[PDB]
Design a protein around this ligand. Sequence first.
Ligand SMILES: Nc1ncnc2c1ncn2[C@@H]1O[C@H](COP(=O)(O)OP(=O)(O)O)[C@@H](O)[C@H]1O
Ligand SMILES: *CCc1cc(CC*)nc(N)n1
Ligand SMILES: [Mg+2]
Lengths: 214, 28
Amino acid sequence: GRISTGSKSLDKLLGGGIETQAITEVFGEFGSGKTQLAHTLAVMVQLPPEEGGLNGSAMYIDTENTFRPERLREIAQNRGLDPDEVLDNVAYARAFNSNHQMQLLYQASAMMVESLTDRPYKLLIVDSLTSHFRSEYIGRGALAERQQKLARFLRMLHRLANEFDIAVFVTNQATLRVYLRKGKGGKRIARLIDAPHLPEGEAVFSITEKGIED
Amino acid sequence: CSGFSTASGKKLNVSTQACQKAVKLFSG
Ligand SMILES: Nc1ncnc2c1ncn2[C@@H]1O[C@H](COP(=O)(O)OP(=O)(O)O)[C@@H](O)[C@H]1O
Ligand SMILES: *CCc1cc(CC*)nc(N)n1
Ligand SMILES: [Mg+2]
């Protein structure tokens, strides 16, 4: 299954949108649109496939204190959706450290089994995948433990994507890596990284009251 | 216990038993 990003241009670069049974990783500097894309996907996944969704629910793990329910309400209202229904279909959790981030995947798996209902979870967002690891290993970047912990976290994410047929979307400041940046005139640009046999070009997108869109 | 809530603010709970089952299925 594929979830639309809200932007026809970015969807075309991604082959239709982000895939289930896969980890899509968006990386870029602060202000590049990573969190806004996550918020938009959390609404789009709820739509029927003809409208870019998978008739599903979204799970959002926030490690940077940047999750905004009022933004989901605005995206829903500006796409003609009931905002209260959209908020009821998004489960969110703040992760305060890397241990908590991993523990929340066990709770996520329990919620996913229970939802297997007319609106199963189809999207898991981790925004961001590495913020806690970077802060916890300041002055200790050479320690193998940091890479080993991240490897265990990614292994669990792949297991969830495959067992529940869910798209995993992670941000970084990977089945598929996407780089976001700003060009001339504040143009927002996305391109694929280390993706042989996939589009090599760039896609321009915008951030508006509807979230991500052309 | 810091876990998940709906974006509307409703705490979503996972039983100790359901938690243990998930850890058992995915920890090994
Ligand atoms: N409700 C909104 N409506 C329009 N633009 C918004 C809204 N909220 C945030 N933005 C824009 O999103 C951009 C920041 O994107 P964000 O996803 O937070 O970046 P990153 O997570 O990569 O640091 C800013 O240009 C900001 O003005
Ligand atoms: C109370 C939150 C929580 C979740 C999990 C995994 C199900 N383990 C622990 N110890 N605590
Ligand atoms: Mg962000």
